Design a protein that fits this description.
Chain B: One of its GO terms (biological process) is response to heat. Chain B: This is RNA polymerase sigma factor RpoD. Chain B: One of its GO terms (molecular function) is DNA binding. The structure is cut from a larger assembly and holds chains A (50 residues) and B (556 residues). Chain A is α+β, with helices and mostly antiparallel strands. Chain A contains two helices and two strands, in the order H-H-E-E. Chain B is mostly helical and 556 residues long. The chains are: A alpha+beta (50), B mainly alpha (556). Bound molecules: chapso (2 copies).
Chain lengths: 50, 556
């Protein structure tokens, strides 16, 4: 019952890389740059609601 | 902008303020246990008092919001206070803690230093006393008192420094030297007084006598100083005496008339009025001259003596000050043991401070032991005595308290070396007491229970609401008494005149104090056996019923 602290500090005070945190908490979409064009690997399910 | 301007708004903009808020929104400082109490009470005069975790229902928060008034100084108060971060240390514990925290630990050699300064101050004042011929008079007067057998041998001295025989002979030679140096008054007399004072250095007087002698010399100096101050007051204020010429002519002697007669010769008009109160002024000058005739030395050595006594006393006082502030921490350290005998902490530390003062004043370094160990004894004794005395509501003598404590210790010991418990007889076994007084002391131990202790909650009933007052006689009995007076008045009215007066006067019926046989007879002027016989005949004849039936039934 003390002051209010922000909380990624906890999640990082166990010596946790930001990159590992993003890998833990979010799936990734990987894009490739080639032929000066852009493409996305599509999973149709993920498009719902857009 | 701060961390409360966003709160005070909410309070009345959203109706309430949950505990979470007033907790995190505090600055950094005054978080002290329940420092919030004051800001919550101010915020309460606006309408909050939120519950455990901020519930809601209940359209009723504006009656209490109106029931907390316009006058909002508080707002200003809180703002200022929470905008300065001066530690709101209200609890006296903290502030005293800091005050003692200021004085660092006066190491060992500093302590012996200040002990030397104390000794030096006392010795200085002792020498100063030696130096005016009105202090040995009273000495010898009370020495003779002790020797002539009008006093006691232990009421004047407690051992000299470098046996009663030796004291008697030294006072014989003192009398001789004193009288010869008084005769030789007419330079040489000053040297002989110095030598007498050097022999008088030998003496050590009982503390009470040292106090009384410094006080007798203080009161004579009081007379001197008051007479001088009043004479110079009357002069400068009534005679308009310029204060620089006052200095020049008056200063130095304050005893001779040279400045008196130069001022009157000064031809000033106030100098001529100077005779209007010349009798008073010059009488005060003469009285001062007589005071110095019993002093005898001069009017500068009075100055010297008073200034040296003040200096010595100040030195000693300052040294003792040093010691006490250095050992306050020790006092509080010793205090921690006794906190839970139903007394407050600070009272204990104060009693310890008094004990430390006494210890400091009586401590001797020459014994070669460290001060702290010696002071401990007085601090503990003082603390124990005060806790014993100011503890109980019905104060109990200290020996009885010690006996109760011993009883408790024995009780516990036997209870745990016996298994069940000790019966009062077994307690009497362990003690040499007659076993009768064990139960008495067991009764004495009961600590009055608080009159407000809440009873089993039928809410808003306390204990006091039960205790009834047996003093009040019942109204029934008052009606009885009224009927009694009526019936006695009627039966007396049935009696003859003088029989009635006899019975009324022997007792108090319808009159104040009752007169005995001789005084009633005096009021009849016939005082003899006949009056008691008249009383007895009335009594006997009233025994017969029909006159007694009303009271015969009236018996109870
Ligand atoms: C502190 C204590 C409070 C007791 C209490 O609150 N009981 C509540 C009991 C509630 N129950 C068990 C009866 C249930 C309720 O009735 C129903 S519910 O549980 O509340 O729903 C107070 C209240 C009455 C006080 C006693 C009397 O002075 C007489 C006597 C004086 C002697 O010198 C010392 C002993 C005695 C026995 C006292 C002791 C003590 O000083 C008492 C018990
Ligand atoms: C502590 C006690 C509470 C008892 C109680 O709460 N019983 C509850 C009993 C409940 N039961 C057993 C009957 C079951 C009920 O069915 C449960 S329920 O009540 O219905 O919930 C109250 C009730 C009677 C009170 C005493 C009398 O004034 C006499 C005397 C006056 C003096 O000046 C002060 C001391 C004395 C001894 C008083 C003390 C104290 O003030 C007493 C003991």
């Amino acid at each position: 019952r003390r002051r209010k602290l922000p909380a990624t500090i906890i999640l990082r005070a166990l010596n946790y890389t930001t990159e590992q945190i993003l890998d833990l908490f979010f799936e990734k979409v990987i894009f490739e740059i080639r032929d000066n064009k852009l493409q996305m690997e599509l999973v149709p399910e993920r498009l719902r609601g857009e | 902008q701060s961390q409360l301007k966003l709160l005070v708004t909410r309070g009345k903009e959203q109706g309430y303020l949950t505990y979470a808020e007033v907790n995190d929104h505090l600055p950094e400082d005054i978080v002290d246990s329940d420092q919030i109490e004051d800001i919550i009470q101010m915020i309460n005069d606006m309408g909050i008092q939120v519950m455990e975790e901020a519930p809601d229902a209940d359209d009723l928060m504006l009656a209490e919001n109106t029931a907390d008034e316009d006058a909002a100084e508080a707002a200003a108060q809180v703002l200022s206070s929470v905008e300065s971060e001066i530690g709101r240390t209200t609890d006296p514990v903290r502030m005293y803690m800091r005050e003692m925290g200021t004085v660092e630990l006066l190491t060992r050699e500093g302590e012996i230093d200040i002990a030397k300064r104390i000794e030096d101050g006392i010795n200085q004042v002792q020498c100063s006393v030696a130096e005016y011929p009105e202090a040995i008079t009273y000495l010898l007067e009370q020495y003779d008192r002790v020797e002539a057998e009008e006093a006691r041998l232990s009421d004047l001295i407690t051992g000299f420094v470098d046996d009663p025989e030796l004291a008697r002979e030294k006072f014989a030679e003192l009398r001789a030297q004193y009288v010869v140096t008084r005769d030789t008054i007419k330079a040489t007399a000053q040297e002989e007084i110095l030598k007498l004072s050097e022999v008088f250095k030998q003496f050590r007087l009982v503390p009470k006598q040292f106090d009384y002698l410094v006080n007798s010399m203080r009161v004579m100096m009081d007379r001197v100083r008051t007479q001088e101050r009043l004479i110079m007051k009357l002069c400068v204020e009534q005679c308009k005496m310029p204060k620089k010429n006052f200095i020049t002519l008056f200063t130095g002697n304050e005893t001779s008339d040279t400045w008196f007669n130069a001022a009157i010769a000064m031809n000033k008009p106030w100098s001529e009025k100077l005779h209007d109160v010349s009798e008073e002024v010059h009488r005060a000058l003469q009285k001062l001259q007589q005071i110095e005739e019993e002093t005898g030395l001069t009017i500068e050595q009075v100055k010297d003596i008073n200034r040296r006594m003040s200096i010595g006393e100040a030195k000693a006082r300052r040294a003792k000050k040093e010691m006490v502030e250095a050992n306050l921490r020790l006092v509080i350290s010793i205090a921690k043991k006794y906190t839970n005998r139903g007394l407050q902490f600070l009272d204990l530390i104060q009693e310890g401070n008094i004990g430390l003062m006494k210890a400091v004043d009586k401590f001797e370094y020459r014994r070669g032991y460290k001060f702290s160990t010696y002071a401990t004894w007085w601090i503990r004794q003082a603390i124990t005595r005060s806790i014993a005395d100011q503890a109980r509501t019905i104060r109990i003598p200290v020996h009885m308290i010690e006996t109760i404590n011993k009883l408790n210790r024995i009780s516990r010991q036997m209870l745990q070396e016996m298994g069940r418990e000790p019966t009062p007889e077994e307690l009497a076994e362990r003690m040499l007491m007659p076993e009768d007084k064990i139960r008495k002391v067991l009764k004495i131990a009961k600590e009055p229970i608080s009159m407000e202790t809440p009873i089993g909650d039928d809410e808003d009933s306390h204990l006091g609401d039960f205790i009834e007052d047996t003093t009040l006689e019942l109204p029934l009995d008052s009606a009885t008494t009224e009927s009694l007076r009526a019936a006695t008045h009627d039966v007396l009215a049935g009696l003859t005149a003088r029989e009635a007066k006899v019975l009324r006067m022997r007792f108090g019926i319808d009159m104040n104090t009752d007169y005995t046989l001789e005084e009633v007879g005096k009021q009849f002027d016939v005082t003899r056996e006949r009056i008691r016989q008249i009383e007895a005949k009335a009594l006997r004849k009233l025994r017969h019923p029909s006159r007694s039936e009303v009271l015969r039934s009236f018996l109870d």
